[PDB]
Structure formats: C-alpha cells, structure tokens
C-alpha cells in the first residue's frame, strides 16, 4: 500500500473546506456543577 490524495478526475471526491462563522457558534461543554459555592458568580447565588 502507498498513500496518495483524492482527486475529482481520478475519483469523484475532493477535499471539503467551508468557512467558519463566529456568530453561529455552538459550544459543547457542560458545567461540572451548578448552584453551589465555588461555581457561580455572586449575582447568581439565590440563597436557597
């Protein structure tokens, strides 16, 4: 085996490149804790 590239005239596939847009970003990162001391801003402590 020998590794080469993909071409639209030897196969029908190419490299797929698209543009990144800042305002359409979604994060995938969940907080480990919530609502407890040490993990929230002072504005968000509800004094339960």
């Amino acid at each position: 085996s020998v590794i080469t590239s993909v071409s639209p005239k030897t196969s029908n596939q190419d490299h797929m490149i698209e543009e990144f847009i800042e305002q359409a970003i979604v994060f995938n990162n969940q907080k480990l804790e919530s609502g407890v001391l040490g993990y929230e801003s002072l504005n968000d402590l509800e004094l339960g």
């Binding site: 993909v6 029908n12 596939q13 797929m16």
Partner: protein, 113 residues
Amino acid sequence: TTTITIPNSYPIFTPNQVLTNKDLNRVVTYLDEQNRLTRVYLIGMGIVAGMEVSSIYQPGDVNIVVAPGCGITSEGYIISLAETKLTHYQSGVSVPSALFAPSEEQTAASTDQ
C-alpha cells in the same frame, strides 16, 4: 454488490485462550445478522402502519406534520415515528453519498445539496 448472505461461521471458545477483538466482534455481528435476516426474509419490507404527511399553513402556523407509525428498512432496521411537526429549515446542506448506499458499498461518491 449482492444481497446479504447468511452467516456461516462464529468463534467457539475453549479454556486457556488469549482473547482478541475478533472473537467478540464476529459473534455480535453474527447474532445481529440473524435477527435482521429473520425480519427481512420471513416477514417483509416497508411501511407497516401508515405515515401520512400533511402541510398546514395558517397566519401564525406554517408546518409540516407526519403521523405516527412503524416500518421496516430493507436491511432490517426498525423505524418508529410519533407525530413529528417540522417548522424550521436549512438549505444547501451537504450530505454524504454513503448515507443512501448499501453498507458494503465501496466506491467513490461526492456529497449532494
């Protein structure tokens, strides 16, 4: 290339062995093939309970509604829907060609819009 062939081999275990990936993967694939072969070769393929599609337009409501039901794919996967109401859309989405191809399909195909 061809229709799914009935399996004809699966690992048998004996004491004092070194276990590898294949001795588990082949049995999982064997049993899954048995189940899906049952469904497709002795019952049939297609939509069992009706899934009618409707399109509703109102001043406040623009939607596309699909009614519940069940169905069998041509390779034995079960699809089951319940009252799906589609309201949003996104145009020009690139979809791989292998999304509609057989699982054994080895070839080269571009994405579509």
